[PDB]
């Protein structure tokens, strides 16, 4: 699974997410990746969102559009909203994983619950940064 | 302007894996960011930066989507890939597909030029040739470490 | 208090358009799809029983497009889709695309119980379905 | 596309949604119907909804968990809820339709913004409702 998220210049947001799935899994299985406010949700009032992980737990949790729920009807903060969605009501259903996450106010979390998440950002004009492990 | 992009999450260990192994990720994804970062600064859309860094991390062997996606237990590929613009809340997703090399580019297709958010298997395949997106074998996604995983 | 609501679709329903003999087909198959489920409730049935089964009439009932009375697509096939959540447990199935599976919704089912995954599509979905001892039918069964 | 929530008596939610789809639609097209959170969501913390209508709006929307996250988050009774939703979000994005929802204490709405919507609702033990046309 891989995926992006961006806030351009306009002050828009957009997420887009791919992935070829889980090794050795039952051909016609979906996972979170093609399904809006599972594995992939924008909207410039909140939060783009795109996500890596348990594929039936992203689903059942809408992990993507519960980021942007908790910050536009709970008031929570980006980072309150990945701490109580990726550390704890997604280990709560058995799920793994982690997902990006940009604000329209460019506020960007990487949270994840796994040994590793592939990713990188950066701000425009600026020198990214990676990561792999804790 | 910002961006941010991830290659999956899961049981990465350190134990098993080189520095230089690891250097060929991180050079990956700080290609992938840059290039990205660059579009922002050009003025390009949020919507065209997510559906390039997907592109691109779908290219990447590296990474499990298009070229280097996992197997099935039937030992064949089926990808996935979703796009949402935050301005419009328009969306548009294919799943199930094997004959796609850029499944986000057929989810771009699917947004742009159908009725639906979603399509999938061979309808999405009909619905993205019938529109000029080009037909490949699944070999073409098929690497050595995938399978031996 | 337990309490049951169902629907088979909204739309552009006009009464110029019907009889009161053709709204009474409607109201008689709701009334006795509903009552089912009140009875079921009533004798102790779980949440996720009751909607299975007003699901599983509302497929049957030729009025309604789920199961049998599906519309066709731009090829005159048929492809069914259905969902069910469980609230307690918050586990779900659903398969799309499907063609040769009778009641979507019992796939669906089978999908949340039986499998790892929430959703399965097209002739996996099937095919799954199939190795669990769901029957085969042919498409022609949904055409009104 | 058809649909049932329920409430039972020991206080569990769950719903479920079918259909043959879109009208004349293009081969391998998927509607809201098979979506969790779009056509179909439950949860004994908020309510069980069962949606129909304009496929690519309810996704786009997630007008079912929509319900959920407006009563759960923003503390909007089912009444507010699906009002919110079905009369203000869904047509101001294109959509059509209505949705049928129970909440966990047993309040029941069957919304919709379009001319019909073939609905019945009933308490156990007590005398079913049916409805097509509004009012
Ligand atoms: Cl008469
Ligand atoms: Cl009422
Ligand atoms: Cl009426
Ligand atoms: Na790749
Ligand atoms: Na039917």
């Known amino acids: ?134 | 302007a910002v961006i941010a992009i991830h290659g999956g999450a899961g049981a990465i260990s350190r134990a098993q894996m080189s520095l230089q192994q690891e250097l060929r990720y991180i050079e990956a994804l700080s290609a992938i960011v840059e290039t990205g970062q660059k579009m922002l600064e050009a003025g390009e859309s949020a919507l065209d930066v997510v559906t390039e860094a997907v592109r691109l991390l779908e290219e990447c062997p590296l990474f499990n989507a298009g070229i280097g996606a996992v197997f099935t237990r039937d030992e064949t590929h089926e990808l996935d890939a979703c796009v949402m613009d935050g301005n419009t809340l328009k969306a548009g997703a294919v799943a199930g597909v094997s004959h796609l090399r850029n499944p986000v580019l057929a989810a771009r297709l699917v947004m742009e030029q159908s009725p639906h958010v979603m399509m999938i298997g061979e309808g999405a395949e009909n619905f993205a040739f019938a529109r000029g997106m080009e037909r490949v074998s699944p070999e073409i996604f098929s690497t050595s470490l995938r399978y031996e995983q």
């Open chain 1, 1 to 134: 699974t891989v995926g992006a998220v961006a806030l351009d210049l306009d002050g828009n947001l957009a997420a887009a997410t791919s992935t070829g799935g889980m090794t050795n899994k039952l051909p016609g299985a979906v996972g979170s990746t093609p399904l809006v406010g599972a594995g992939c949700y924008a909207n410039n009032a909140s939060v783009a969102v795109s996500c890596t992980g348990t594929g039936e737990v992203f689903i059942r949790a809408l992990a993507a559009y519960d980021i942007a729920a908790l910050m536009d009807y709970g008031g929570l903060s980006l980072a309150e909203a990945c701490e109580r969605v990726v550390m704890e009501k997604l280990p709560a259903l058995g799920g793994s994983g982690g997902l990006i996450a940009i604000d329209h106010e460019g506020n960007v979390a990487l949270p994840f619950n796994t040994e590793g998440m592939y990713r990188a950002w950066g701000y425009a004009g600026d020198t990214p940064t990676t990561g792999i492990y804790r």
